[PDB]
């Protein structure tokens, strides 16, 4: 099953956002990132995707279809806007085993606030 995510200059959480910023998925699902506004892409954050998952980085302004297979948590960023908090969390399966690690990892303050928000909303 496919989940669509919009890449935006501005949205509900402020500037430089993925909508949704939390994607709940199962193995074999696709997540389709749509460049509604220009200037955006999607890239896996290093040491913030599951064991066995392949890193990725899409082309700026490209419609990108990510297939997620490995269970666990994936923190993805918009490469230019990571420092402005432009991130999404993908959770594949229940109780993603690497979520607490990702939460504890070094990352921009604004990214952290946004990440904690979607985790709390998902509970
Ligand atoms: Zn961006």
UniProtKB/Swiss-Prot annotation:
Domain of life assignment: Bacteria
Main localization of the protein described in the UniProt heading: periplasm
Keywords, ordered alphabetically: Copper, Electron transport, Metal-binding, Periplasm, Signal, Transport
Gene Ontology MF terms in the entry: copper ion binding; electron transfer activity
Gene Ontology cellular component list: periplasmic space
Residues reported to bind Cu cation: 40, 78, 81, 86
Entry function: This soluble electron transfer copper protein is required for the inactivation of copper-containing nitrite reductase in the presence of oxygen. Serves as a direct electron donor to the nitrite reductase.
Protein name according to UniProt: Pseudoazurin
Native organism: Alcaligenes faecalis
Span within the parent record: 24 to 146 of 146
